[PDB]
Motif scaffolding. Structure first.
Motif, short mmCIF file in Angstrom:
data_model
loop_
_atom_site.label_atom_id
_atom_site.label_comp_id
_atom_site.label_asym_id
_atom_site.label_seq_id
_atom_site.Cartn_x
_atom_site.Cartn_y
_atom_site.Cartn_z
N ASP A 107 0.82 -1.21 0.00
CA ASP A 107 0.00 0.00 0.00
C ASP A 107 0.86 1.27 0.00
OD1 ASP A 107 -2.08 -1.88 0.31
OD2 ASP A 107 -2.52 -1.30 2.39
N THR A 108 2.00 1.23 0.69
CA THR A 108 2.82 2.42 0.88
C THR A 108 4.29 2.06 0.88
OG1 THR A 108 2.67 2.16 3.30
CG2 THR A 108 1.12 3.67 2.26
N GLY A 109 5.13 3.09 0.88
CA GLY A 109 6.57 2.90 1.00
C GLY A 109 6.93 2.18 2.29
N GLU A 110 6.46 2.71 3.42
CA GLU A 110 6.78 2.11 4.71
C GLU A 110 6.28 0.67 4.80
OE1 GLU A 110 6.03 5.95 6.03
OE2 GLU A 110 4.98 5.57 4.16
N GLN A 111 5.05 0.43 4.36
CA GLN A 111 4.49 -0.92 4.41
C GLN A 111 5.37 -1.91 3.66
OE1 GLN A 111 0.24 -1.83 4.40
NE2 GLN A 111 0.53 -3.21 2.64
N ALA A 112 5.84 -1.47 2.49
CA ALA A 112 6.73 -2.27 1.65
C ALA A 112 7.97 -2.68 2.41
CB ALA A 112 7.12 -1.48 0.41
N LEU A 113 8.61 -1.71 3.05
CA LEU A 113 9.86 -1.95 3.77
C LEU A 113 9.64 -2.69 5.07
CD1 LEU A 113 11.50 1.46 2.97
CD2 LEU A 113 12.13 -0.77 2.02
N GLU A 114 8.52 -2.43 5.74
CA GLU A 114 8.16 -3.19 6.93
C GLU A 114 8.03 -4.65 6.52
N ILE A 115 7.12 -4.90 5.58
CA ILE A 115 6.89 -6.25 5.04
C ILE A 115 8.20 -6.93 4.63
CG2 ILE A 115 5.97 -7.51 3.04
CD1 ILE A 115 3.50 -5.59 3.25
N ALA A 116 9.06 -6.18 3.95
CA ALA A 116 10.41 -6.65 3.64
C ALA A 116 11.15 -7.12 4.91
CB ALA A 116 11.21 -5.57 2.94
N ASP A 117 11.25 -6.25 5.91
CA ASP A 117 11.94 -6.59 7.18
C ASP A 117 11.34 -7.81 7.84
OD1 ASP A 117 13.39 -4.27 6.70
OD2 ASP A 117 13.21 -3.51 8.75
N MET A 118 10.02 -7.83 7.95
CA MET A 118 9.31 -8.96 8.57
C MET A 118 9.68 -10.29 7.93
SD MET A 118 5.49 -7.60 9.38
CE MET A 118 5.25 -6.15 10.41
N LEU A 119 9.74 -10.33 6.60
CA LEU A 119 10.17 -11.52 5.89
C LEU A 119 11.64 -11.84 6.15
CD1 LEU A 119 8.53 -10.95 2.39
CD2 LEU A 119 7.69 -12.44 4.19
N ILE A 120 12.48 -10.82 6.16
CA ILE A 120 13.91 -11.01 6.38
C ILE A 120 14.18 -11.57 7.78
CG2 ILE A 120 16.18 -9.93 6.52
CD1 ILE A 120 15.05 -7.82 4.48
N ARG A 121 13.45 -11.08 8.78
CA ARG A 121 13.62 -11.53 10.17
C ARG A 121 13.19 -12.97 10.40
NH1 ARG A 121 15.36 -7.08 12.83
NH2 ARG A 121 14.73 -5.11 11.82
N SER A 122 12.39 -13.52 9.51
CA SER A 122 12.05 -14.95 9.54
C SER A 122 13.32 -15.79 9.45
CB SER A 122 11.12 -15.33 8.39
OG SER A 122 11.84 -15.59 7.19
N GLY A 123 14.26 -15.33 8.64
CA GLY A 123 15.47 -16.09 8.38
C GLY A 123 15.22 -17.20 7.39
N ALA A 124 14.05 -17.18 6.74
CA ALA A 124 13.68 -18.21 5.78
C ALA A 124 14.01 -17.84 4.33
CB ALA A 124 12.20 -18.51 5.92
N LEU A 125 14.30 -16.56 4.07
CA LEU A 125 14.59 -16.06 2.72
C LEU A 125 16.07 -16.09 2.37
CD1 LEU A 125 12.52 -12.76 2.56
CD2 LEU A 125 12.09 -14.78 1.14
N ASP A 126 16.35 -16.36 1.10
CA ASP A 126 17.69 -16.18 0.57
C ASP A 126 17.82 -14.81 -0.09
OD1 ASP A 126 17.98 -18.86 1.32
OD2 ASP A 126 19.18 -19.32 -0.47
N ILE A 127 16.76 -14.36 -0.74
CA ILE A 127 16.82 -13.12 -1.50
C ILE A 127 15.48 -12.42 -1.51
CG2 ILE A 127 16.32 -14.37 -3.66
CD1 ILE A 127 18.22 -12.18 -4.97
N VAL A 128 15.54 -11.09 -1.48
CA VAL A 128 14.36 -10.25 -1.67
C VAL A 128 14.70 -9.14 -2.67
CG1 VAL A 128 14.90 -8.85 0.36
CG2 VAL A 128 12.59 -8.83 -0.59
N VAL A 129 13.77 -8.88 -3.58
CA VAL A 129 13.94 -7.83 -4.57
C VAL A 129 12.87 -6.76 -4.32
CG1 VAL A 129 14.03 -7.31 -7.04
CG2 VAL A 129 14.85 -9.51 -6.20
N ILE A 130 13.30 -5.50 -4.27
CA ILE A 130 12.40 -4.38 -4.04
C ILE A 130 12.33 -3.58 -5.32
CG2 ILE A 130 11.94 -2.33 -2.62
CD1 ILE A 130 14.46 -4.85 -1.41
#
Length: 308
Positions: free
Chosen positions: A117-140
């Motif tokens: 929905d927004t810039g912040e939401q995008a980056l929050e969602i990004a962080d949340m996924l990264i903190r899982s430790g389940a991802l190898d890569i994320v593209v923004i």
């Protein structure tokens, strides 16, 4: 010798206080990590020093509209997945062609995708996924489109760059711990921050159109590694992006094959191992895709030489 010791000393301290790769001679060899994310081009992988993109770090790929930067990012995703990794795509552009992505090797069915929905939401969602430790890569995709809630709602006005600064501070922590690579795609016409947090920055351009008689085939693409904290920067690479197919691994192997003298020329003929790959570059290219075993051996030998 009195000087060389005081200099080595100085570098060692700098390195211990600010991080490895905080200073280096441009002629220095690259310190090879355990695993990297190959780019799709060996030429770029080499230009990058460490055989691909680093894990646990922020990465920025920038260039004009239609330069191939997405394609490079898509190839990163494919390789990460191909080595059994999970991938995510934070999409604020709504431009992704999944059929194209599929043809490069992206497992699209299992690609996580968020349309924020927004810039912040995008980056929050990004962080949340990264903190899982389940991802190898994320593209923004992309920096320009990370528009702030306040701007998207009504109403000072310099806060998008502040949003990126804040978000990157947090994310960089998470990324380091997780071992996840974040790629930021970025246009030319919040990059002020990304420029410093990024361990790698890649300048991507279209150089020239490819042949196929009177109708084209794709674009020769050029990438300069303008920033590289993992290995000597300011290196560049050239490879071919073919429409509907992506980066020609094979074409990149030939180019670097002859660059290293592992592949020779008998005029228009391309020699390898005393045997002929093909006459003209396209037959050589075609020969290598039909003959994967020998293409992998060429790649094998190229990495052995450079220690990639």
């Amino acid at each position: 010798p009195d000087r060389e010791k005081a200099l080595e000393l100085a570098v060692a301290q700098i390195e211990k206080s600010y991080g490895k790769g905080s200073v280096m001679r441009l002629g220095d060899e690259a310190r090879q990590p355990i695993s990297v994310i190959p780019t799709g081009s060996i030429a770029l992988d080499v230009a990058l020093g460490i055989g691909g993109l680093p894990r646990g770090r922020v990465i920025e790929i920038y260039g004009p509209e239609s330069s191939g930067k997405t394609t490079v990012a898509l190839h990163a995703v494919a390789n990460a997945q191909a080595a059994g990794g999970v991938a995510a795509f934070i999409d604020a552009e709504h431009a992704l062609d999944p059929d194209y992505a599929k043809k490069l090797g992206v497992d699209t069915d299992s690609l996580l995708v968020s349309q924020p929905d927004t810039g912040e939401q995008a980056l929050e969602i990004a962080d949340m996924l990264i903190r899982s430790g389940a991802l190898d890569i994320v593209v923004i995709d992309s920096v320009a489109a990370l528009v702030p809630r306040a701007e998207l709602e009504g109403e000072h006005v310099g806060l998008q760059a502040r949003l990126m600064s804040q978000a990157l501070r947090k994310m960089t922590g998470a990324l380091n711990n997780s071992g996840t690579t974040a790629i930021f795609i970025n246009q030319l016409r919040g990059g002020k921050a990304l420029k410093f947090y990024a361990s790698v920055r890649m300048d991507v351009r279209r150089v020239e159109t490819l042949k196929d008689g009177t109708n084209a085939v794709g674009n020769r693409t050029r990438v300069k590694v303008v920033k590289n904290k993992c290995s000597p920067p300011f290196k560049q690479a050239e490879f071919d992006i073919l429409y509907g197919k992506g980066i020609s691994r094979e074409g990149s192997l030939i180019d670097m094959g002859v660059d290293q003298g592992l592949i020779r020329k008998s005029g228009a003929w391309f020699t390898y191992e005393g045997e002929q790959l093909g006459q003209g570059k396209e037959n050589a290219r075609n020969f290598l895709v039909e003959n994967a075993d020998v293409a992998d051996e060429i790649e094998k030998k190229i990495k052995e030489k450079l220690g990639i």
